[PDB]
Design an enzyme around this catalytic site. Structure first.
Site, mmCIF file in Angstrom:
data_model
loop_
_atom_site.group_PDB
_atom_site.id
_atom_site.type_symbol
_atom_site.label_atom_id
_atom_site.label_comp_id
_atom_site.label_asym_id
_atom_site.label_seq_id
_atom_site.Cartn_x
_atom_site.Cartn_y
_atom_site.Cartn_z
ATOM 1 N N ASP A 55 0.758 -1.237 0.000
ATOM 2 C CA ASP A 55 0.000 0.000 0.000
ATOM 3 C C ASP A 55 0.801 1.308 0.000
ATOM 4 O OD1 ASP A 55 -2.565 1.576 0.448
ATOM 5 O OD2 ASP A 55 -1.477 1.948 2.320
ATOM 6 N N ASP A 58 4.797 1.126 3.863
ATOM 7 C CA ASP A 58 4.748 -0.039 4.719
ATOM 8 C C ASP A 58 4.626 -1.266 3.841
ATOM 9 O OD1 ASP A 58 2.233 0.231 3.730
ATOM 10 O OD2 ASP A 58 1.183 0.073 5.624
ATOM 11 N N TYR A 206 -7.749 1.986 6.798
ATOM 12 C CA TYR A 206 -8.648 2.167 5.671
ATOM 13 C C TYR A 206 -10.054 1.741 6.054
ATOM 14 C CZ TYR A 206 -4.579 2.995 2.781
ATOM 15 O OH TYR A 206 -3.429 3.517 2.246
ATOM 16 N N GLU A 424 4.549 11.011 2.947
ATOM 17 C CA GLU A 424 4.402 9.598 2.676
ATOM 18 C C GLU A 424 3.938 9.424 1.255
ATOM 19 O OE1 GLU A 424 1.815 7.166 5.180
ATOM 20 O OE2 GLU A 424 3.248 5.517 4.877
HETATM 21 O O1 LIG Z 1 -16.386 13.019 6.430
HETATM 22 C C1 LIG Z 1 -15.624 13.734 5.472
HETATM 23 C C2 LIG Z 1 -15.283 12.847 4.321
HETATM 24 O O2 LIG Z 1 -14.396 11.823 4.839
HETATM 25 C C3 LIG Z 1 -14.080 10.814 3.869
HETATM 26 O O3 LIG Z 1 -13.256 9.823 4.485
HETATM 27 C C4 LIG Z 1 -11.889 10.239 4.677
HETATM 28 C C5 LIG Z 1 -11.580 10.267 6.160
HETATM 29 O O4 LIG Z 1 -12.392 11.229 6.812
HETATM 30 C C6 LIG Z 1 -10.114 10.582 6.375
HETATM 31 O O5 LIG Z 1 -9.821 10.546 7.765
HETATM 32 C C7 LIG Z 1 -9.279 9.539 5.650
HETATM 33 O O6 LIG Z 1 -7.887 9.838 5.812
HETATM 34 C C8 LIG Z 1 -7.025 8.723 5.493
HETATM 35 C C9 LIG Z 1 -6.286 9.008 4.202
HETATM 36 O O7 LIG Z 1 -7.211 9.077 3.133
HETATM 37 C C10 LIG Z 1 -5.283 7.905 3.940
HETATM 38 O O8 LIG Z 1 -4.543 8.193 2.767
HETATM 39 C C11 LIG Z 1 -4.352 7.785 5.127
HETATM 40 O O9 LIG Z 1 -3.447 6.746 4.919
HETATM 41 O O10 LIG Z 1 -5.101 7.462 6.290
HETATM 42 C C12 LIG Z 1 -6.034 8.502 6.631
HETATM 43 C C13 LIG Z 1 -6.730 8.035 7.886
HETATM 44 O O11 LIG Z 1 -7.306 6.751 7.684
HETATM 45 O O12 LIG Z 1 -9.579 9.569 4.252
HETATM 46 C C14 LIG Z 1 -10.954 9.245 3.982
HETATM 47 C C15 LIG Z 1 -11.109 9.211 2.483
HETATM 48 O O13 LIG Z 1 -10.844 10.482 1.903
HETATM 49 C C16 LIG Z 1 -15.346 10.150 3.390
HETATM 50 O O14 LIG Z 1 -15.030 9.141 2.443
HETATM 51 C C17 LIG Z 1 -16.220 11.181 2.743
HETATM 52 O O15 LIG Z 1 -17.422 10.570 2.300
HETATM 53 C C18 LIG Z 1 -16.558 12.235 3.749
HETATM 54 O O16 LIG Z 1 -17.344 13.228 3.107
HETATM 55 O O1 LIG Z 2 -0.325 4.520 10.750
HETATM 56 C C1 LIG Z 2 0.310 5.763 10.498
HETATM 57 C C2 LIG Z 2 1.647 5.569 9.811
HETATM 58 O O2 LIG Z 2 2.491 4.824 10.730
HETATM 59 C C3 LIG Z 2 3.790 4.580 10.170
HETATM 60 O O3 LIG Z 2 4.574 3.931 11.121
HETATM 61 C C4 LIG Z 2 3.638 3.718 8.934
HETATM 62 O O4 LIG Z 2 4.905 3.310 8.430
HETATM 63 C C5 LIG Z 2 2.892 4.527 7.899
HETATM 64 O O5 LIG Z 2 2.789 3.798 6.693
HETATM 65 C C6 LIG Z 2 1.516 4.838 8.463
HETATM 66 O O6 LIG Z 2 0.790 5.626 7.533
#
Ligand SMILES: OC[C@H]1O[C@@H](O[C@H]2[C@H](O)[C@@H](O)[C@H](O[C@H]3[C@H](O)[C@@H](O)[C@H](O)O[C@@H]3CO)O[C@@H]2CO)[C@H](O)[C@@H](O)[C@@H]1O
Ligand SMILES: OC[C@H]1O[C@@H](O)[C@H](O)[C@@H](O)[C@@H]1O
Ligand SMILES: [Ca+2]
Ligand SMILES: [Ca+2]
EC number: 3.2.1.4
Length: 605
Positions: A55, A58, A206, A424
């Site tokens: 992904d 990591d 996710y 990242e």
């Molecule tokens: O509620 C607001 C919108 O949020 C969307 O979901 C997002 C999360 O709120 C956000 O925390 C998350 O962040 C992820 C990031 O996308 C990811 O790349 C990273 O590795 O981890 C973060 C934390 O898990 O992203 C999601 C997706 O954008 C809803 O999907 C949306 O409907 C909503 O309006």
């Molecule tokens: O979970 C938050 C972050 O922690 C780090 O230690 C990981 O290597 C990242 O890939 C991850 O996004």
């Protein structure tokens, strides 16, 4: 001539996806610093789940975003095949989509069973090191009727379906195979409703925040395009009315963008492009307006430099995803003012990521002026001590990777590897970015580099032996040897190594009186010496069984202290392996290290 060579960027983007590969890599491998990894993936459940993409920085193979990445990468090659052809990257895109799709097949052993994860997120993140020597166990998780997951399933269908359109003419048999799997994954997702994050431990990385309602429309629209079955379009349009509305109004969500979790926004533009109904056109309009001129006074945050900052984590990815969907909508809408707006918005957002910003620096590793040099990536860093701080700079250039970039509307950014929020990389970060570049190459052009990728060269010895005189003596020679494994081209295991220390028998020394002892040896201490020819003998230290890998302080080395006593008459000045050894620990070129009998360091007599 284009402002930025979008063809070089696209070319380097495909290299990214090849450095994220897992499993047994092919002979044609273009990334010289990557090797076989994740070879026992699936063993716990009796299946072969090797392959796929890691992904981010990591090594956990998350199936939700990996599926999305495949659909966005395909979608862009369907909208602009000419872009991928001109940059000479079409054979690579197809090589990447085929790599991820082969895995989606391996991971679908039966119609209603899909493997969505391989690796524990916490166990995996606690270790910093190359993926070729991952020492932890990697569990495999799945979703079936007992615990369903409509979101990840309908996405894997959307992906295999969208990809079949790319392989349709080249490999019609393979294309058919994907459409088949895709049908089963969509039926599974519609029949057994559920949020995949309620069944597999991925909620902290996710999580399904939007739910599956968006992937049911998204998945259907794609099976419609792949099969041509009108029932699928009917299915997509029907499910479209249950998409999330916003706060209090009956207006469908328009304040975010399309990313690995919410595909609503893609469906706005996709159905509008297919049917041409005002219903969808209005949604796609209200959405894309909030990202440009605004709606009702609200507008996505913008920095003085011209970047659309939607959130702190992966800002450029979000702006890049919108930039692609905006360019697609820009072709189907007739309104000259809206068409200009969306198109211009998209080129500006991509240009910002490629260098047109207040920092005048690129945000795609390996591309442009002042690109990042230390993204948060484990294998590219090349640490051999389980530390994110050592070595200072990443030992490898991850050409093509789009970093998070500025997380606030102030155009600020620091190339800090320990900042996984802004520095990242990830498979889905380059998904929408790549689709745009393909759309921009077709329109503005560009030319790929002929000699690419460059062939990196190790930053010194990788597997070697350091030594020094532990205790000076005239009737014995006490050496302190240290085996080291700091490999990174690619990182490898050294589990069957031995080393020899040659010496010349001196006048008066009876070889029967030579003894080899130690007060500290992490390997074996020998009893006798071996005669080669004449006055030449050697002591062999046996370390077979010890796993010396670049993945920890004590894991990467082995200390061996050994004294060779010969009694009065012993003279080390005429010994082969003694040449150069002094009082400071430094590489010993005359002590030969063998890996299963094959020399890896040193020169023999
Ligand atoms: O509620 C607001 C919108 O949020 C969307 O979901 C997002 C999360 O709120 C956000 O925390 C998350 O962040 C992820 C990031 O996308 C990811 O790349 C990273 O590795 O981890 C973060 C934390 O898990 O992203 C999601 C997706 O954008 C809803 O999907 C949306 O409907 C909503 O309006
Ligand atoms: O979970 C938050 C972050 O922690 C780090 O230690 C990981 O290597 C990242 O890939 C991850 O996004
Ligand atoms: Ca969703
Ligand atoms: Ca001697």
């Amino acid at each position: 001539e284009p402002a930025f060579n979008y063809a070089e960027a696209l070319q380097k983007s495909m290299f990214f996806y090849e450095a994220q590969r897992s499993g047994k890599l092919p002979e044609n491998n273009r990334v010289s610093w990557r090797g076989d990894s994740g070879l026992n993936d699936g063993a716990d459940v009796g299946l072969d789940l090797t392959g796929g993409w890691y992904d981010a920085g990591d090594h956990v193979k998350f199936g939700f975003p990996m599926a999305f990445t495949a659909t966005m990468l395909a979608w862009g090659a369907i909208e602009s095949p000419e872009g991928y052809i001109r940059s000479g990257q079409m054979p690579y895109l197809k090589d990447n989509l085929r790599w991820v799709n082969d895995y989606f097949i391996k991971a679908h052993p039966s119609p209603n069973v899909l493997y969505v994860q391989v690796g524990d997120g916490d166990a995996d993140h606690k270790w910093w090191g190359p993926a070729e020597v991952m020492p932890m166990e990697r569990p495999s998780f799945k979703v079936d009727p007992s615990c369903p997951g409509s979101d990840v399933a309908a996405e894997t269908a959307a992906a295999m379906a969208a990809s079949s359109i790319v392989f349709a003419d080249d490999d019609p048999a393979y294309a058919a195979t994907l459409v088949q799997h895709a049908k089963q994954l969509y039926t599974f997702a519609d029949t057994y409703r559920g949020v995949y994050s309620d069944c597999v431990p991925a909620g902290a990385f996710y999580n399904s925040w939007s739910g599956y309602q968006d992937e049911l429309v998204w998945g259907a629209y794609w099976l419609y395009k792949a099969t041509g079955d009108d029932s699928y379009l009917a299915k997509a349009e029907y499910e479209y009315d249950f998409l999330s509305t916003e706060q209090q109004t009956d207006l469908r969500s328009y304040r975010w963008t399309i990313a690995w979790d919410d595909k609503s926004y893609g469906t706005y533009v996709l159905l509008a492009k297919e049917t041409g109904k005002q219903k969808y056109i209005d949604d796609a309009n209200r959405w894309l307006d909030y990202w440009t001129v605004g709606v009702n006074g609200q507008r996505v945050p913008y920095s003085p430099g011209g970047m659309a900052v939607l959130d702190t984590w992966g800002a450029l990815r979000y702006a890049a995803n919108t930039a692609f969907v905006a360019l697609v909508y820009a072709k189907v809408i007739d309104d000259p003012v809206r068409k200009q707006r969306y198109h211009d918005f998209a080129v500006r957002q991509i240009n910002y990521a490629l260098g047109d910003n207040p920092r005048n620096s690129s945000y795609v590793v390996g591309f442009g002026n002042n690109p990042p040099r230390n993204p948060h990536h484990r294998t590219a860093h090349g640490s051999w001590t389980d530390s994110i701080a050592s070595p200072a700079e990443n030992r490898h250039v991850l050409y093509g990777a789009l970093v998070g970039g500025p997380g606030s509307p102030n155009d600020a950014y620091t190339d800090d590897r320990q900042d996984y929020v802004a520095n990242e990389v990830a498979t889905d970060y380059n998904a929408g970015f790549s689709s745009a570049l393909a759309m921009l190459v077709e329109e503005y052009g560009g030319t790929p580099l002929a000699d690419f990728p460059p062939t990196e060269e190790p930053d010194g010895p990788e597997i070697f032996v350091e030594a020094q005189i532990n205790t000076p003596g005239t009737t014995f020679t006490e050496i302190k040897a240290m085996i080291r494994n700091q490999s990174g081209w690619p990182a490898r295991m050294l589990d069957k190594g031995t080393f020899r220390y040659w010496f010349t028998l001196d006048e008066g020394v009876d070889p029967a009186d030579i003894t080899v002892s130690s007060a500290y040896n992490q390997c074996a201490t020998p009893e006798d010496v071996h005669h080669v020819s004449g006055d030449l003998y050697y002591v062999e230290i046996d370390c077979t069984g010890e796993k010396i890998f670049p993945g920890g302080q004590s894991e990467h080395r082995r200390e061996v202290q050994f004294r060779i006593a010969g009694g009065p008459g012993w003279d080390p000045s005429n010994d082969w392996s003694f040449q150069g050894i002094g009082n400071e620990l430094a590489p010993a070129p005359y002590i030969v290290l063998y890996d299963d009998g094959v020399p890896v360091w040193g020169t023999a007599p």
